[PDB]
Design a protein around this ligand. Structure first.
Ligand SMILES: Nc1ncnc2c1ncn2[C@@H]1O[C@H](C[C@@H](N)CC[C@H](N)C(=O)O)[C@@H](O)[C@H]1O
Length: 258
């Protein structure tokens, strides 16, 4: 059911291409390549490392991790159409694998990965499933491994306004506070749990993206439609407003198995 909802609405082929337009080639989330460089700036891996990317999208993250470190990267994404697109973006590289599957039913061996990485994907999971997923991640990490996440978070639900309630409802997101998120990781026995509210940085990424959209409107209209432009424009406007006033937050989380 989840698969069909995502494939048929938010992540249709065209929806994915619209995201790629504003985020940059191979990315469909916040800050594209430049944010990825920053998020991985203190991460150490090498050609012998094994990495899992949960919700791998068009595969940009896997491509970058493999380029930077030479690591084995395995991306899982529930949307078959997105995985098909990702597979067209990489060739002749036996250390990048993209696989269409629900991360919640996927099986991996215990103590398997040096890094489990996820960028703006876990918002799609119910609270019960976030907990289940992080339990799986704990098992799947090597003793020496690291968990590294960015995800959409929010102020406490009691504070939400009508527009924000509707945004979350229509997308079927489950947005929790940065603090609740960190508490889940702690409950799952992760160590050295570091959470950062990166909402200010996120706001900066959004502003750069918004400016890019405006300055490249003519090309956007040629590729897509004015209707799609307006939707995207308004969507970024709201994210900028809501991040500034702390209604919507961008959470970063890093933790270790030991
Ligand atoms: N249960 C799930 N299992 C695997 N992938 C999922 C699941 N739920 C959502 N996704 C994927 O999570 C991705 C989230 C995207 N917002 C981001 C993709 C990618 N991480 C990027 O930064 O460009 C989508 O491509 C979804 O299809």
């Amino acid at each position: 059911s989840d698969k069909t909802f995502l494939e048929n609405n938010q992540y249709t082929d065209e929806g994915v291409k619209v995201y790629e337009f504003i985020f940059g080639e191979n990315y469909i989330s916040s800050g594209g390549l430049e944010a990825t460089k920053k998020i991985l700036s203190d991460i150490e891996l090498n050609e012998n490392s094994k990495v899992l990317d949960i919700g791998s999208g068009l595969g940009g993250g896997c491509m970058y991790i493999n380029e930077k470190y030479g690591a084995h990267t395995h991306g899982i994404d529930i949307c078959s159409n997105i995985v098909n697109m990702a597979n067209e973006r990489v060739s002749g590289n036996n250390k990048i694998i993209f696989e269409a599957n629900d991360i919640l039913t996927k099986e991996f061996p215990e103590n398997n990965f040096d890094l489990i990485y996820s960028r703006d994907a876990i918002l799609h999971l119910s609270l019960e499933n976030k907990n289940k997923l992080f339990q799986k991640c704990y098992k799947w990490l090597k003793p020496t491994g690291t968990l590294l996440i960015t995800d959409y978070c929010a102020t406490e639900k009691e504070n939400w306004d009508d527009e924000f309630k509707e945004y979350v409802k229509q997308r079927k997101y489950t947005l929790i506070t940065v603090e609740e998120y960190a508490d889940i990781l702690t409950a799952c026995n992760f160590k050295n749990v570091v959470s950062k509210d990166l909402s200010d940085y996120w706001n900066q990424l959004l502003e750069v993206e918004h400016k890019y959209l405006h300055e490249n409107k003519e090309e956007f209209l040629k590729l897509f439609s004015e209707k799609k432009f307006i939707s995207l424009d308004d969507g970024w406007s709201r994210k900028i407003k809501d991040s500034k006033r702390k209604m919507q937050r961008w959470g970063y989380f890093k933790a270790t198995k030991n």
